[PDB]
Amino acid sequence: QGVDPPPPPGPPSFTGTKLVNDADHPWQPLREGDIRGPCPGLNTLASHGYLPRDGVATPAQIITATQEGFNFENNAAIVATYLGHLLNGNLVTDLLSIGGATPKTGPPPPPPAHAGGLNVHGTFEGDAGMTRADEFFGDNHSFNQTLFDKFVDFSNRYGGGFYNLTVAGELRYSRIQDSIATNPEFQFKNVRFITAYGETVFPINLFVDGRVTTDRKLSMEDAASIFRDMRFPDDFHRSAVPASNEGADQVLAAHPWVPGGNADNQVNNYVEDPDSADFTHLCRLYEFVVGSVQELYPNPTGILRRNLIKNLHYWWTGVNVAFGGCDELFPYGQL
Ligand SMILES: *[C@@H]1O[C@H](CO)[C@@H](O[C@@H]2O[C@H](CO)[C@@H](O[C@@H]3O[C@H](CO[C@H]4O[C@H](CO[C@H]5O[C@H](CO)[C@@H](O)[C@H](O)[C@@H]5O)[C@@H](O)[C@H](O[C@H]5O[C@H](CO)[C@@H](O)[C@H](O)[C@@H]5O)[C@@H]4O)[C@@H](O)[C@H](O[C@H]4O[C@H](CO)[C@@H](O)[C@H](O)[C@@H]4O)[C@@H]3O)[C@H](O)[C@H]2NC(C)=O)[C@H](O)[C@H]1NC(C)=O
Numbered sequence: 046q047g048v049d050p051p052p053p054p055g056p057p058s059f060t061g062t063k064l065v066n067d068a069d070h071p072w073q074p075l076r077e078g079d080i081r082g083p084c085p086g087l088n089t090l091a092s093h094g095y096l097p098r099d100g101v102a103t104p105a106q107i108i109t110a111t112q113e114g115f116n117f118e119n120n121a122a123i124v125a126t127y128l129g130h131l132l133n134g135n136l137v138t139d140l141l142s143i144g145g146a147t148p149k150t151g152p153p154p155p156p157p158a159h160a161g162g163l164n165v166h167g168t169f170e171g172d173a174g175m176t177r178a179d180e181f182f183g184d185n186h187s188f189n190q191t192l193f194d195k196f197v198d199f200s201n202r203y204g205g206g207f208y209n210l211t212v213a214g215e216l217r218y219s220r221i222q223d224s225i226a227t228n229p230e231f232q233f234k235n236v237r238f239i240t241a242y243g244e245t246v247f248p249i250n251l252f253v254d255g256r257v258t259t260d261r262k263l264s265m266e267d268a269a270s271i272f273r274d275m276r277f278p279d280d281f282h283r284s285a286v287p288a289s290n291e292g293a294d295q296v297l298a299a300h301p302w303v304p305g306g307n308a309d310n311q312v313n314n315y316v317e318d319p320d321s322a323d324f325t326h327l328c329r330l331y332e333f334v335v336g337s338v339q340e341l342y343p344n345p346t347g348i349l350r351r352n353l354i355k356n357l358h359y360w361w362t363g364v365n366v367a368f369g370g371c372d373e374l375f376p377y378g379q380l
C-alpha cells in the first residue's frame with residue numbers, strides 16, 4: 046500500500062577526503078535485471094555498491110551515496126535527487142530507477158506519470174551531453190565511443206591531454222553546435238540548460254582525486270573508467286570538500302549561450318526561448334518543474350497525494366538554498 050518517505054539526509058558528519066574505492070565497495074559486473082542509465086556518477090555508485098547494485102534506490106539512499114562516494118554537496122544532491130524522483134520515480138514505493146523502466150520500482154503510477162527512470166527524455170535528461178548521444182538518434186543512455194573520442198580530442202587540444210576547465214568551456218559549446226547541426230528536435234532550455242553546465246564541471250570537481258589540491262585535471266584513463274566502465278580509478282579518494290558545480294559560470298562565460306531549441310523540426314534553426322530558466326532566473330526552473338509535476342499528477346489523492354506533497358517540500362528545501370530563495374508552491378495544499 047506504500048511507504049512514508051523520510052526527509053533527506055543532511056551533509057555527512059565527515060566531509061574530508063577518504064578512500065571510496067575500498068574493500069567494502071568493490072566494482073562488480075552487471076547481473077540480469079541490474080539497471081544503469083545516463084548518469085556516470087550514479088552508475089559508478091551502483092557498480093561499487095554505494096547504491097543497490099540493481100540501480101533502483103530511494104531518494105535518501107541516492108543522497109547518502111552521492112555524499113559518501115563523491116562528497117557531492119548536500120543541497121546539490123537534494124536538488125538533483127528529488128527532481129529526478131518527482132518526474133521519473135515512484136512516489137508511493139519511494140523508489141527511483143537510475144536508468145529505464147523496471148518492475149523493481151513497484152506498481153505503476155496513474156498515467157500520464159510513468160516512474161520510467163532517469164532515462165526518460167525531455168524534462169530532466171536532455172541533449173548535448175559529453176558521452177551520451179541525443180535521444181533523437183535512438184539511445185540517450187549508453188556510453189558513446191565517438192563522443193568520448195571528441196572528449197579526448199578536446200582534452201588534447203585545450204587541456205594538454207587532460208580534461209580541465211578550459212576544455213570544459215570549449216567542449217560544451219562544440220557539443221551544442223553538433224546538436225544544432227544534426228538534431229532537428231534539439232532542445233536546450235529549462236532544466237537541461239541549467240544541468241548541462243553543472244555536468245561539464247562535475248568531472249573536474251568530483252572525478253579528480255581529492256588528494257589533488259592544485260591544477261585539477263582529469264586523465265582520459267580515469268574518465269574512461271567512470272564514464273564507460275562505471276568504475277572508480279584504483280585507490281580513488283573523493284573530493285576533500287563538499288562540491289558540485291564550481292566553475293560552471295566560467296564555462297558559460299567562455300561561450301555565452303541562451304536557452305532555446307531548433308524550431309519547426311529543422312536543423313541549423315536555433316531559436317531563443319525568453320521564458321526559459323537561465324542562470325540569473327533560476328526560480329523559473331522551480332516553477333517549471335512544479336508545473337511539469339502537475340501535468341504528471343493532475344488529481345492525486347490518498348498516499349500518492351501525501352507523498353507528492355512531502356517530496357515537493359523536500360525538493361524545495363534544497364532549491365530554496367541552491368537557487369538563492371524561491372517562494373514555495375503548494376499545488377496540492379498541505380498535509
Ligand atoms: C588547462 O590545460 C591547459 C594545458 O596545460 C592550460 O594551459 C596553460 O595555460 C596557461 C595560462 O592559463 C599558459 O601560460 C600562459 O601563457 C600565455 C601565452 O604565452 C605565449 O605568449 C607569451 C607572451 O609573449 C610575449 O613576448 C613575445 C616576445 O618574445 C611577444 O612577441 C609576444 O607578443 C608577447 O608580448 C610567451 O611568453 C609564451 O612563450 C613562452 O613560453 C613558451 C612555453 O610554452 C616558450 O615556447 C616560449 O619561448 C616562451 O618562453 C607563449 O608563447 C602567457 O601570456 C602567460 O604569461 C603570464 O604568466 C607568466 C607566468 O605566470 C608571466 O611570466 C607573464 O608575464 C604573464 O602574466 C602564461 O605563461 C600555459 O602556457 C598553458 N599551457 C599549455 C601547454 O597550453 C590551462 O591553463 C588549463 N586550464 C586551467 C583552468 O587550468
Ligand SMILES: *[C@@H]1O[C@H](CO)[C@@H](O[C@@H]2O[C@H](CO)[C@@H](O[C@@H]3O[C@H](CO[C@H]4O[C@H](CO)[C@@H](O)[C@H](O)[C@@H]4O)[C@@H](O)[C@H](O[C@H]4O[C@H](CO)[C@@H](O)[C@H](O)[C@@H]4O)[C@@H]3O)[C@H](O)[C@H]2NC(C)=O)[C@H](O)[C@H]1NC(C)=O
Nearest residue numbers: 177178179182184189190191192226227228229310311312
Ligand atoms: C554516437 O553518437 C554520435 C554523435 O551524436 C552518433 O553520430 C551521429 O549520427 C547522426 C545520425 O546519423 C549524424 O547526423 C546526421 O548528420 C548529417 C551531416 O553530418 C555531416 O557533418 C558532420 C559535422 O556537422 C560530420 O561530423 C559528419 O561526419 C557528416 O559529414 C546530416 O546529413 C543528417 O541529417 C539528415 O537527417 C536528419 C534527420 O531526419 C534531417 O534533419 C536532416 O535535414 C538530414 O536530411 C544527420 O543529422 C551525425 O553526424 C553523427 N555524428 C558523428 C560525429 O558521427 C552515433 O550514431 C552514435 N553511435 C552509435 C553507434 O550509437
Ligand code: HEM
Nearest residue numbers: 083084086111117125129163170171174175176177244251
Ligand atoms: C544526485 C543524484 C543524481 C541524479 C538524479 C543525476 C541525474 C543525472 C541525469 C538524469 C543525467 C543525464 C543528463 C543528460 O546527460 O542527459 C546525469 C548526467 C550526469 N551526471 Fe548525474 N545525477 C546525480 C548525481 C551525480 C553525481 C554525484 C555526479 C558526479 C559525481 C554526476 C555526474 C553526472 C555527469 C558527469 C553527467 C553527464 C554525463 C554525460 O554528459 O556524458 N551526477 N545525471
Ligand SMILES: O=Cc1ccc(CO)o1
Nearest residue numbers: 121122124125240243244
Ligand atoms: O547530475 C547531476 C546534476 C545536474 C544538476 C545538478 C544540480 O544538483 O546535479
Ligand SMILES: O=Cc1ccc(CO)o1
Nearest residue numbers: 120121124239289290367
Ligand atoms: O547554478 C545553478 C544550479 C543548479 C543547481 C545548483 C546547485 O548545485 O546550482
Ligand SMILES: [Mg+2]
Nearest residue numbers: 171172174177
Ligand atoms: Mg542526455
